[PDB]
Design a protein around this ligand. Structure first.
Ligand SMILES: [Ca+2]
Ligand SMILES: [Ca+2]
Ligand SMILES: [Ca+2]
Ligand SMILES: [Ca+2]
Lengths: 626, 605, 626
């Protein structure tokens, strides 16, 4: 008799295969069995082994959804409305970290088991890309059910257990949430194309003609030909700002707005602490405009921010906005209010300038965007991560008018080749350890809350051939064991093969090998993460670029405002050669720099230009004491 | 000063050129033709515009006596050192194919294309994709292949073009122009509603609204693949001129793709229309009149019985396609092994319709085709219809093109058994590149791209396929611990005599010495054991080639008593070892076989 | 029909296997063949494929040897009796570099093909471990024939071609040569145990008792029990200072001395430029002494040095001597003579102190041995290589009386574990790129001629399980191809398997990958090799350790004596943390340091302590101009 599941097979009056699972369902010739003569079983027959309240339900023409009271109440933390400024974020796919169910795909159940590593690393909050139920036609960003987590990951109660356990250690949880669109398979859309006179008939934008909203540009110009697609059911055009399978929400309907914010109370009611809003420059669409950054779109964001500010105190709202600095600051809100919209916006053109600066060996590309950066509300924080494109529209922020480097990125072969490809830090810097430590020093010292991608802390690579976005979404390399220790299942049943690259593969780089070795990149990242934790000037301090005699090196002091305030000095060399520089630190005369990693005392600053020397791509961190 | 040279090294141009394995030309920091539209006419080159390739002596039956080798040009060999397989690289590796013992090479589409659908979206019918080479490089290919007895056929999508085709750009821009009616256009979507959607999960309608022409165009496949109005007489002559072009260069034939969807009529399913066969009958006419001795193959994801008429009228001996493909073959062979019974194979043969005399079936070892990704099955005529879902392996590899070795868990015995059937059963066999050395599949990079991984030649860098940086490779060679190039490759397999490659070559060389495997009659022999499938391939006439093939489908040793009194007093000679077995009398001949084993015998006088 | 050679098999009135060889001999059933019916060949028979003036000949009781005039005359270089001071040596096994014969073992024939890489790297002379005919019972150090090169490597004419081609590019050739002993299989020994009254009966030390020379210690105390072994033929004890199969030469016989120096004229007459003398503290043995460093042993070395000085001008003589500095200086000769013995002696305890210094993060372990080092003749040069033990007796130089670190090496786990094991630089430093660049900066700047082991320039590792000495003797990793591009033959027929280690293997590190990448260790070594070439103060300059305010960093100036002399400054940090140091460079007031790799100009030195800053394990190289 054969017993099979697809990848693993075992041959055997009597009434072993389960023994790394308990939980499995067995059938024979399409018959759910619980002795062979009873079932007319003959030689060389086959038994199959398949896996075994959970989901919004459409009843009488109405899509019902459960409430947060139907599930367990997760314990929250002492409310600190300014935690997101001191936080270090860790973006990671649930699919890619750990597989506890041994089903080939990383699940929530694996995430709780790996929380000891993330605390040991020194992160303060985990950022989860969308994991709700979806057909996975656009990387989980085409939500099919807001109230149902993807079954391949787990159940909602597993999410409550994660928020609980991550909270017991002092770590928070945020997630993406697509605002502009849902998937075709969402019940709201299926009701619109079938019951126009029903309650969900105007939940989406419908028009008898395509010559409407013509001034808006097509984001995915290589795949889609128009933001209007002819639905075969309703016999009408529906508005999709991304792909055809992603119809845009009609926020012109107030029930849509009330439904979307209701989903926001649902997860906040469960215990989550934050949200990154995806595709928010496209909520509202009006004729004659580009259907982007409209004032009513910002008005809805203001309403959401209060709903949280009132009902869910101490939460955080982030904004994914592929816009040049000066246009994203609008999504912080009105400056006089001190923050009436998203608490955080991401400074996208940061590394695109940092990358070009170290290749041009000059600080000017970085000093420019910092001065050009507008001020933000005091209770707000810029979001700085080490990537060039956003994980929704693989495009880089640029401005023909306000970016002097606009025509210079294409003059870089590394930039011109990795266009539209999201890559990890190590392959972006050709695995140069000196540069990896340099880019990490900048990200952990520049004004704003840093975001770390999973795997960049040990030097993981990417399989770009697997996708321009999925290539960076490879399983986390834990051990040099099978499946990189990420799953104890068959390799052919995994969601994606762990990288077997000769230099970036799990056999060569993983947490186990780096953990058991000093001078490992993992220990470097953890050391800097612990150093930065002991100094709030790295999170809420004021930025001041200092006078230098050498533009090849970027130097700046971050000082916590007030007497006896935390004052650190960061010096970063962008040249591949040793460079000297005299510093204009006369503002801190009689201050004594103390290097942070080694606690080594350096000469006391005075009134003469302070002389430092750095190697190729080196950096220094001093504490300014008195 | 110091200088970086990148595509990284810190004279400079030459020194960088030599280290990259490329030619130089190929005070005064970093250092980094087909068809043409002439107003409103899309002019295309002619067959006389290039040199003529040397052809082979006219054989009106070679397609029957042939073993085909499907190879994606992007995957065999890279000579331009650009990371992708080109034409130029293929001609170098003709020595391996001639040594392997194939007869002709089948090439997936290589035309200029934006590669939005595996090169099946043709942007220009008269320009080879620049990464693959140029039209002049094909002439050298067809020439070089022919100087050694090897022929060339390629895919040719018939039903649709790419959206980027100049015919479609003039159709949506100049509706009153000469190309404005080269495609099907509609003002409503409620037309041809009785036709089913092929890609039901990707597309929601076979009509699509162009923003320029503000009209609905017909596409049987993808939105970038608009169907062609074959009711337009100029479309036909333009397409048969495309056929005239390559045949004038020297190609030995084509496979016509998506042909059951050419014409369209309201009230029908827009499939297998009489005008579609009437058109193909005219294409036959023009190839037999102008280029005698060429072959037309019909891609048809249809059930045997719904494909036989694509051969044409049997009275004429075949006035349409010379070849239709017998698709449900291995799905029954695969089921037969899991059933340890010969009924899944013996039943399809007992219900396969006749074919014209100058026709031939096409057999390949795959469960799904390359255009779509569906497994053919008929609720009425397939008695295994529902039992495929009762197989976890079949259920897992659904819509997934997978090679032979992963399908059979790399079981050497099973691979030899499937190879023996493919090379002995009636029909011209097709070998996918990699099945000869037991290559593996990557899967994760595409349902159809998983089998399109680079040819694993040597255990050197890039599997000996390219001399370029692995980053510039179009697809990385498989580094699987069992299926990788370090484990399986042409270099190692050629050495060890017990290798699969030496096995397949031995079968190819043995089959070449016996035409009964190609044009002989088929006669299943009654066996007392249903686990064993034994058949005879006999050539009509005295002293005709008569071979006996016995195949065991159980994983255990099995005996079999056979009915060979029609061949009394003969002597079975095994082909691989030329060992003489006892002469057959009036007794049921007894044979014993290992698990998943097979014997080939030659009944001689 | 089968055609086989052992690892590769091919099955086939007719009269392919040769096609990557021409050259092969074929036999069938022990019959040298040049049609099967002629030879009674049947089905399933087998044909074997075997490989096809060269050797000293023992005639009438006398071991005759050829002369240098019987072979081709290799062109020499313009005589420069001081080239060995400016030279950078590259020790490499012929067996391990390249296999041109495709026989599984690296040959001389491969060495000429790879000479373009060694010039491109920037070496000045190649050092070849012993390659004469030998039974390979002790790593080729048990010479069986001085006049016959090992056939597995090639012929003598292949050695003349190598000396020719290496000379056309400006590179020289030296080799080891065992002085104290030969192998049992040497014809001189076989004549001694068989014909005592013959000419070779007193070529070795024979005694009827073992109670002679009792005060000498046993080197290989773990394998041998006595330096006396009872020969079964002569029925007498013969003296072996190493292993039993290595009987010591009897230099008390003057014909032995004349024969040994004759071998020296043989290779120098061919065209070689140098010799490292192996086991020279054991030539002469006298009763009551330790049979080591005896004055008559030094007297023989003096005689040899002249024989070269007179007949072979411009050659070089090196001395392998596991002795503390102060005892090895004796092998330079009498200081007043200016050099009457070996031109070079190797400073063994260099890195043993350098290793302990960077682990103790203090310059004192290095500053001590330098001051304790005695002066040497002006026309002499210390030999500095990066290893801890010598490749003959896997032991480390130490002195209970004159080594203050004597009892401290065992207190280091890395040292205590790698005892008796010769390891490469990268595994010795845990593949820390910063430390590898630091140890290389010291070796390329300290007083003396540097010696580089093959593979350490790209970061190769070792397979210590293959042998305590053979583990470092793995094939050179050229390409990620089969056999690391070292041989185009079967992997099972290779002499040793190329390292497939996940981090040190050829797939991960090889010359091809490093050559095509900036910031690669190969390019670093080549850059430093080209920088040092443009500055003779790195070879013949005077050493002066400078006054420093921080013992964590080693600083020294190397100046070519005279006006406008070459003056470089090397600063080397031994701490894993950033460290500042004020330099006492008042001797070079108004001198301007110019960093060598980047040509960056640093502040002009004056009368105030000069301040520099370094990172963890960093180093700087400045040129002192005026
Ligand atoms: Ca919208
Ligand atoms: Ca190419
Ligand atoms: Ca059509
Ligand atoms: Ca001696």
């Amino acid at each position: 008799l054969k017993v099979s599941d697809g990848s693993s097979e075992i041959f055997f009056t009597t009434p072993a295969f389960a023994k790394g699972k308990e939980s499995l369902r067995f059938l024979y010739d399409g018959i759910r069995i619980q002795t062979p003569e009873d079932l007319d079983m003959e030689d060389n027959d086959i038994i199959e082994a398949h896996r075994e309240v959970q989901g919004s339900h459409v009843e009488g023409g109405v899509v019902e959804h459960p409430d947060a009271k139907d599930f367990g109440s997760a314990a929250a933390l002492p409310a600190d409305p300014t935690w997101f400024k001191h936080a270090v974020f860790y973006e990671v796919l649930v699919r890619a970290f750990f597989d506890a169910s041994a089903d080939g795909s990383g699940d929530l159940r694996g995430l709780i088991d790996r929380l000891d590593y993330l605390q040991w690393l020194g992160i303060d909050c985990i950022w989860l890309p969308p994991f709700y139920d979806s057909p996975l036609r656009d990387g989980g960003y085409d939500i099919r059910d807001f109230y149902k987590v993807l079954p391949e990951f787990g159940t909602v109660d597993d999410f409550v257990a994660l928020v609980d356990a991550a909270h017991r250690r002092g770590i928070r949880i945020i997630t993406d949430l697509v605002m502009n669109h849902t998937s075709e398979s969402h019940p709201w859309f299926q009701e619109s194309r079938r019951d126009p006179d029903g309650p969900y008939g105007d939940y989406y934008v419908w028009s008898d003609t395509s010559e409407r909203y013509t001034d808006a540009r097509i984001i995915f110009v290589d795949t889609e030909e128009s933001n209007w697609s002819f639905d075969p059911v309703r016999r009408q055009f529906y508005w999709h700002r991304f792909f055809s399978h992603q119809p845009d929400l009609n926020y012109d309907n107030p029930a849509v707005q009330e439904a979307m914010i209701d989903v926001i109370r649902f997860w906040l009611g469960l215990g989550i602490d934050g949200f990154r809003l995806d595709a928010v420059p496209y909520l509202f669409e009006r004729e004659g405009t580009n259907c982007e950054n409209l004032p009513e779109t910002h008005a809805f964001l203001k309403r959401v921010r209060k709903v949280v500010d009132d009902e869910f105190p101490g939460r955080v709202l982030l904004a994914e906005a592929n816009q040049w600095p000066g246009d994203v600051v609008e999504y912080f809100g009105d400056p006089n209010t001190g923050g009436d919209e998203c608490h955080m916006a991401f400074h996208f053109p940061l590394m695109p300038r940092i990358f070009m600066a170290v290749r041009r060996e000059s600080r000017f590309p970085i000093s420019e965007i910092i001065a050009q950066t507008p001020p933000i509300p005091d209770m707000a924080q810029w979001g700085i991560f080490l990537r060039n494109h956003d994980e929704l529209t693989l495009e880089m922020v640029t401005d023909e008018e306000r970016d002097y480097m606009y025509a210079e990125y294409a003059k870089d072969p590394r930039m011109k080749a990795n266009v539209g490809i999201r890559r990890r830090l190590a392959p972006l810097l050709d695995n140069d350890r000196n540069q990896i430590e340099l880019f990490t020093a900048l990200l952990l010292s520049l004004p704003g809350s840093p975001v770390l991608y999973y795997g960049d802390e040990i030097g993981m690579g990417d399989v770009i051939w697997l996708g321009d976005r999925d290539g960076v979404r490879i399983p986390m390399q834990w051990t040099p064991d099978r499946n990189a220790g990420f799953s104890t299942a068959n390799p052919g049943r995994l969601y994606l093969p762990p990288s077997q690259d000769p230099v970036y593969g799990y056999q060569a780089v993983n947490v186990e090998a780096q953990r058991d070795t000093s001078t490992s990149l993992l220990n470097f990242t953890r050391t800097m993460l612990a150093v930065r934790r002991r100094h709030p000037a790295f999170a809420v301090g004021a930025f001041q670029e200092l006078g230098g005699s050498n533009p090849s090196v970027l130097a700046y002091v971050r000082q916590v405002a007030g007497d006896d305030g935390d004052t650190v000095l960061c010096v970063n060399n962008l040249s591949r050669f040793p460079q000297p520089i005299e510093l204009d630190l006369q503002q801190w005369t009689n201050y004594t720099p103390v290097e942070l990693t080694g606690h080594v005392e350096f000469p006391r600053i005075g009134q003469v230009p302070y002389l430092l020397t750095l190697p190729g791509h080196g950096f220094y961190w001093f504490q300014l004491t008195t």
